[PDB]
Design a protein around this ligand. Structure first.
Ligand SMILES: CCCCCCCCCCCCCCCC(=O)O
Ligand SMILES: [Cl-]
Ligand SMILES: [Mg+2]
Ligand SMILES: [Mg+2]
Length: 133
């Protein structure tokens, strides 16, 4: 049920409050330094019911494949091992990651042709805007 408008190759154009988001995930200073400098490309694709989100950067690459509503094991860019679930709520693609009794959410939604990712951890909100390419 995912909008095919999500599908494509997307480039970060802006990021707000990423440091405090990373810090709340427990990312350490040197890694945050490089994370803040990174300008990743996110590639969303679909094969049958299986959706893939691939993030590419000089510093770290990541890739998850999933079916909506089906928990799956994830390795995040900061090397957290999580149980994740991705869902559709109101045209938004909502990812939840759980590990060690913690939880963070990344909500990706289409806004005037951009993908806007809202990343929440413990009341810290970070917003990152992606342009299709
Ligand atoms: C892949 C760029 C990040 C580089 C590594 C720095 C620490 C990662 C922090 C947690 C993962 C961030 C997820 C951001 C969501 C997004 O914008 O796609
Ligand atoms: Cl980069
Ligand atoms: Mg802040
Ligand atoms: Mg700050």
């Amino acid at each position: 049920g995912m909008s095919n408008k999500f599908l494509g190759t997307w480039k970060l154009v802006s990021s707000e409050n990423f440091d405090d988001y990373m810090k709340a995930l427990g990312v350490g200073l040197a890694t945050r330094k490089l994370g803040n400098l990174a300008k990743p490309t996110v590639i969303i694709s679909k094969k049958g019911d299986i959706i893939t989100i691939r993030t590419e950067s000089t510093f770290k690459n990541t890739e998850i494949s999933f079916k909506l509503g089906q928990e799956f094991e994830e390795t995040t860019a900061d090397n957290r091992k999580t149980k994740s679930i991705v869902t559709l709520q109101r045209g938004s693609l909502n990812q939840v990651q759980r590990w060690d009794g913690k939880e963070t959410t990344i909500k990706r939604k289409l806004v005037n042709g951009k993908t806007v990712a809202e990343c929440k951890m413990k009341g810290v909100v970070c917003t990152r805007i992606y342009e299709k390419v």
